[PDB]
Amino acid sequence: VQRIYLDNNATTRIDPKVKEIMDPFLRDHYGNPSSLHQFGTETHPAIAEALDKLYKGINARDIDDVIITSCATESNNWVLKGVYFDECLKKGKNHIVTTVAEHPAVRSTCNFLESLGVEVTYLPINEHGSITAEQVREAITEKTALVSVMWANNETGLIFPIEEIGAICKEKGVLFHTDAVQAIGKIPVDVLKANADFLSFSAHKFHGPKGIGGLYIRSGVGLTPLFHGGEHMNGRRSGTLNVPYIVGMGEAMKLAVEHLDYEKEVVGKLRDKLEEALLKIPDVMVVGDRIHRVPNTTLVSVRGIEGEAMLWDLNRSNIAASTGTAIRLSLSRFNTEAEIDKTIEVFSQAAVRLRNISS
Amino acid sequence: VQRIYLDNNATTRIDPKVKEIMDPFLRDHYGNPSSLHQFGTETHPAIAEALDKLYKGINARDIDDVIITSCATESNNWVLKGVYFDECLKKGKNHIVTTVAEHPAVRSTCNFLESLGVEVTYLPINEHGSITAEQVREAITEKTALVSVMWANNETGLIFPIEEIGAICKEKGVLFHTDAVQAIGKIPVDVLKANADFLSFSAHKFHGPKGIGGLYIRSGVGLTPLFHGGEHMNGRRSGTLNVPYIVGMGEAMKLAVEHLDYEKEVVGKLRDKLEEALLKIPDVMVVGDRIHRVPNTTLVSVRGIEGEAMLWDLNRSNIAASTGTAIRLSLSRFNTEAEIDKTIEVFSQAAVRLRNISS
Numbered sequence A, B: 001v002q003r004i005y006l007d008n009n010a011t012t013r014i015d016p017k018v019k020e021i022m023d024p025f026l027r028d029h030y031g032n033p034s035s036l037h038q039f040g041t042e043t044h045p046a047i048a049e050a051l052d053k054l055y056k057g058i059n060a061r062d063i064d065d066v067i068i069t070s071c072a073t074e075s076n077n078w079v080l081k082g083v084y085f086d087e088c089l090k091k092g093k094n095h096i097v098t099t100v101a102e103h104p105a106v107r108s109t110c111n112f113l114e115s116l117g118v119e120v121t122y123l124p125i126n127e128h129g130s131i132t133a134e135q136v137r138e139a140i141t142e143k144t145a146l147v148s149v150m151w152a153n154n155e156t157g158l159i160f161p162i163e164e165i166g167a168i169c170k171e172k173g174v175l176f177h178t179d180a181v182q183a184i185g186k187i188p189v190d191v192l193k194a195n196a197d198f199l200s201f202s203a204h205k206f207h208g209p210k211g212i213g214g215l216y217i218r219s220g221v222g223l224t225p226l227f228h229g230g231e232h233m234n235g236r237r238s239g240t241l242n243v244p245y246i247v248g249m250g251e252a253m254k255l256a257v258e259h260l261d262y263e264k265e266v267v268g269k270l271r272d273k274l275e276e277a278l279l280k281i282p283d284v285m286v287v288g289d290r291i292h293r294v295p296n297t298t299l300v301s302v303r304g305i306e307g308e309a310m311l312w313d314l315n316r317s318n319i320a321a322s323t324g325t326a327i328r329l330s331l332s333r334f335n336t337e338a339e340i341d342k343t344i345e346v347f348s349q350a351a352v353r354l355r356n357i358s359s
């Protein structure tokens, strides 16, 4: 059998180099980095190299933190509940601006903050599937504690104007957080350009293991820990380090940014090839503005055949995709031209077959 | 070189079987268990087998949850901040009883809860290094939201009277949590016998990978999520599943409980052998009641030579241990009689050498 995987927004394959690099820390380098003895101190260099890779990936500076979390959900929960106690309660700034497009980690958390009597403005999506810089400026009260806008959307692949929203936040004196989960490895990410105070990411979206992520925290910005216990991560996030996944995620970031031109040049092209071809088969419109997107994602619709049906079919013929209904096909650098061609074929045949049962 | 590792309370070696079982999920079974397509659904059986192993390890029932967390720190933080909102605030039960002996994940969290105006009673340690059932009963007000007592202590290896504290909590109508991190794999753990509502554990203490743990939650007990986003873990703890570490931790628990008689019979004996022998070298008393302890841990003192000095020495001769000052030597099933003998030798020679520089 030979399966085609087009579900990169759900999760990605761990890069083989990433599997290789982690392996020694699952075998004989099993010491707790906190121990003083050799089993501990021996892990120190690989961890430092990892952190370094993470800093360079997002343009963090020495004076910033990139804190290791267990996933972007942790990161996101952490930013929101941290600001809740540091701003919303202790400083009266009882308002948070976000968008409707946000991942549930952000949205549900906000929902919880609402239940305690935080006022949350969920900026509405426009016709383009976007949010504009002016939209958040027009929403900032001076009780606004935080603006949280996702860098790129995982439904459509839509990029939002982070840089611009950054500027507004700087001018207005408001904490800015960007969930960048869907941007790492897909387009360049720059916390300096973004004037982010907080950035979250998750490794499994860029060929690292599931079960680890990061939160960038700008110099001098405070954020009450979500994991108290104050050992690890200059006391900001406690718990014995996930040594293998750290070493791994590090490598994952490095490879991810090394592939940034491949992503735009080749992956993007494969995505255009797929999209263009899908657009033929009679009555198939694409969803969203097709300019401001990460290179890897396309969301096609099939006229009067719910997505689920197309996908269940595609699954049977060994092509994995998901909805966003519409059909979300999302690529990685591990897709090939052959696989796309095949997808065009099997997609169209599937379309055909389902039209005919519809009669 | 041939190193001896006696720092099992810091962390343990991933069991080779555990490394084997996780491996396929780092290689080709990389699908998100939430996907509907084959890459997702194919992970379903291994995950179910894992969870099953976890349930049986602690005697959880079908009607309970064993929720997968990123570590015991997550678990502990989760219980405390969960009860804070569900009991302390929403129900006025503004008091928590714990002990002084607790791991910092519990203690620091409590410290934070104090800062919001929760009243926390930190039960004092006695001469035995213990806490008695009566001590917590005498502390329960009817504003008490939660009792949190650690099952076994990682400093001395001291077991606390969980079963008894359980009974008191049941009688008194109070939520009971036990951090069992230092008990899994060391003595039998039984949430039913314990009348725990909440139990935490962490895999790296029983030959699983760092970076994953569990919280047992009793049937019908509520606990507001620490990770909102409400996808995974019947919405109790959100974030893409750490598939490999889950499969791994599962195996780790199984092997851990399979070795329960080996642990008491052989590991315990090795520990007694080591202890007895150390007790000779002139002026070396052991620390704590030497009856109510997990089999693997001994905490010896050397008269007027701070622990750190003994350890730095021991490190040079390739024996890894830590303080608790006193010297904490903690064993696993991977220690051998040879290694202990060697330790007796090198320990005593080290004692000798440091006496003579002391002059």
Ligand SMILES: Cc1ncc(COP(=O)(O)O)c(CNc2co[nH]c2=O)c1O
Pocket: A009, A010, A011, A071, A072, A073, A074, A103, A105, A150, A152, A153, A154, A179, A180, A181, A182, A202, A203, A204, A211, A213, B034, B231, B238, B239, B240
């Ligand atoms: C933009 C974004 N934010 C946060 C997360 C959560 O990261 P995690 O904590 O590692 O799970 C994801 C991935 N989540 C999903 C992508 O597709 N379905 C999902 O549930 C994401 O795409």
Ligand SMILES: Cc1ncc(COP(=O)(O)O)c(CNc2co[nH]c2=O)c1O
Pocket: A034, A231, A238, A239, A240, B009, B010, B011, B071, B072, B073, B074, B103, B105, B150, B152, B153, B154, B179, B180, B181, B182, B202, B203, B204, B211, B213
């Ligand atoms: C009793 C207990 N509770 C909680 C933890 C925290 O588990 P983690 O979240 O997986 O780190 C540990 C391990 N911690 C340590 C054992 O020795 N030094 C330690 O810091 C522990 O022994």
Ligand SMILES: [Cl-]
Pocket: A081, A082, A224, A225, A226
């Ligand atoms: Cl918090």
Ligand SMILES: [Cl-]
Pocket: B081, B082, B224, B225, B226
């Ligand atoms: Cl919470």
